[PDB]
Design a protein around this ligand. Sequence first.
Ligand code: HEM
Length: 108
Amino acid sequence: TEFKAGSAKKGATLFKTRCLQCHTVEKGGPHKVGPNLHGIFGRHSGQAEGYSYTDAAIKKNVLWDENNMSEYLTNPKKYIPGTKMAFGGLKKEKDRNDLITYLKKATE
Ligand code: HEM
């Protein structure tokens, strides 16, 4: 145990305000700046087909679980140096918790 469940509603609104800009979550959603995230959890870093990932991502070969996702969310480039993800992070564990919740839920 190292991650706890937050508000999905709250997660939904954070995403729209901080991730929507570059990503879709729906099944059959298009990749945009960032890849479609439908089905992320269970998946390894940089394997969505038809998406052009940096070398960095592929090489990392992360198992997208809720826990990893939270560390990544605090600081992407930190986690996967060279990554083309241009996001500062989420310093608050409470905002991250909400988000992963939303994510866990909406990319399923
Ligand atoms: C919002 C805070 C947000 C989330 C959530 C998010 C998720 C995310 C993941 C989990 C990946 C890696 C997935 C995989 O391995 O297939 C990923 C990668 C990229 N993203 Fe992202 N991301 C969020 C924020 C944003 C924003 C605001 C942007 C655009 C300015 C963006 C874009 C990208 C890009 C580009 C990548 C690919 C990295 C690479 O190939 O090196 N994301 N995102």
